[PDB]
Amino acid sequence: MTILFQLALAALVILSFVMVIGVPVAYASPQDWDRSKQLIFLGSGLWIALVLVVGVLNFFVV
Amino acid sequence: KLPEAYAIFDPLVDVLPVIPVLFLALAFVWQAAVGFR
Amino acid sequence: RIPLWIVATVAGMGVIVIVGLFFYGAYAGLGSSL
C-alpha cells in the first residue's frame, strides 16, 4: 500500500510534467490535435483517476 | 511539516511557490522567439 | 546559426543563477552573521 501509494503519487508527477508540456504543443501546431485529442483525453482522464487514487490512498499511509 | 509520507517530496514543494513568476518570464521567451511582433 | 531568442534565454538564466548564487552567499559565506 505504501509503495503502491508512492507509485501512484510519483507517477502522477511525471504524467503532469508530460501533460504540462504536452497540451501546449498539442493545441499549438495544428498538425493534428485530432490524433492528440486521443492522447490528451487519455492523459486528462488518467490524471483525474490518479488524483482520486492518491486521494483515498492517502488516508491509508498518513 | 508535510505528512510523513509526502516527506520524500519535501524538496519538490520547496520550489513550487516560485513557478508563477516563471510564467511572467516565459511570456518574454515567447515574444523573443517570435521576434517581438 | 544559433537563434537569438535561445542565446538570450540561456544567457538570461545563466545570469539569474550566478546572481542567485550571490544571494545564497549572503546567508552562508563571510557575509553572514553566524
Binding site: 510534467f17 499549438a28 501546431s29 | 524538496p11 513557478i19 516563471l22 522567439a33 517570435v34 | 537563434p3 538564466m13
Partner: peptide, 28 residues
Amino acid sequence: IAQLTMIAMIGIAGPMIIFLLAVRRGNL
C-alpha cells in the same frame, strides 16, 4: 539536499514548450 535538480527541469520546461514549436513551426 539538492533540489536544484527540480528547478532545472521545470525551468527548461518553459522554453521547451515553445522550442518544440520552433521545430514543428506553427502558432507562435
